Symmetry: D2
Subunit: 120 residues, 4 copies
């Protein structure tokens, strides 16, 4: 299932637990950006997905502050878990930095990450 240790295409490590209530909890370690060591993540997933072959919708957030660094920014990943021999979580993400109003136009980066339970 969703619970386990995942890696994206760039080597970031996503350690997550999916609870019966639809909760996601865990830690994220980023291979890119103004980040070091582990950061808390929380999110939600559909705990009763369809039975027609569709994936399981989910999302989570990391605020890029821990006991060692603060980048004044947060990323959300939105996507779906696809089961099978090679389980996969396919996502698109938004990374918003705190900015002044004059700089808000350049506050948000966008991209896509794919996660598997094997390293890239």
């Amino acid at each position: 299932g969703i619970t386990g240790t995942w890696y994206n295409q760039l080597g970031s490590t996503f350690i997550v637990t999916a609870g019966a209530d639809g909760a996601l909890t865990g830690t994220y370690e980023s291979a890119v950006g103004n980040a070091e060591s582990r950061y808390v993540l929380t999110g939600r997933y559909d705990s009763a997905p369809a039975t027609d072959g569709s994936g399981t919708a989910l999302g989570w957030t990391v605020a890029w502050k821990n006991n060692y660094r603060n980048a004044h920014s947060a990323t959300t990943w939105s996507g779906q878990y696809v089961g099978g021999a090679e389980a996969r979580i396919n996502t698109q993400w938004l990374l918003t930095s705190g900015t002044t109003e004059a700089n808000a136009w350049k506050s948000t980066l966008v991209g896509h990450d794919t996660f598997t339970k094997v390293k890239p």
Copy 2:
């Protein structure tokens, strides 16, 4: 500043508690009990005091005890304080799909939340 009730531009409301450890927890109401959903996210608990906003994000999976849309939305944005406080966000809404339909799985948009209806 973040803790409390917020209203978007389209008739949605949420109530959130911003914890001292960076947690966001609360309830999102898209329009009655049947429209209330759990929300969970994170925010920068030590933002700059230089005029910059406070970065944050949260997720709602659209399942409750009454309904299930097999989908989830994430909002990514920043809180801006003061007399006209705002949470300015962009969002991604992913639906569970088959592989053949995955190309059309994700909608994108924006929401602005205020403390006054």
Copy 3:
């Protein structure tokens, strides 16, 4: 109609002609970023929209190179024209910079611009 001079919420100037064949042509002047004066734009729009009250889908691109500056980047706006007493073009945009492979993860900004024929 779409043809005319439009302004976004930041005061950028969008001068566009919508041709009978679905073509958009014109110039863009940005209120923000590494930009000076007018840049070429081209795009497309639905020249026969639905008659059920729906807006008119459209999109356009600016590469941020002109005779004065080159930011090595390009923005695409995707949206729809909404007729009314206060005509409006509502868009979401992607701004991709040319980067190295190691920096590609942070190559693309995302935002939303709304245009009217009156300057705010």
Copy 4:
């Protein structure tokens, strides 16, 4: 290196010409290539990219109307071209459908496409 035929991860094809001063013009079609699947594309690219190893920024639009069909929608692709023996155009896209104002919240899909010179 941009001019020619490109193929995405899901079968789609485009034939583009990159003009000297930054114009992109061409046709976007399905893998089958029948006339009913072909649409005009136009866009722009950086005609003087950096020389430090960075990609070439570009974008283009297709409105999904041709002489045969009209889906009342348009897609923009924003990305960069990377040359070499394994040349690529790496993009993210936005697909906006015409909607009423009440449905505007669900008007815009987002995704990503990677284009290569071989199928």
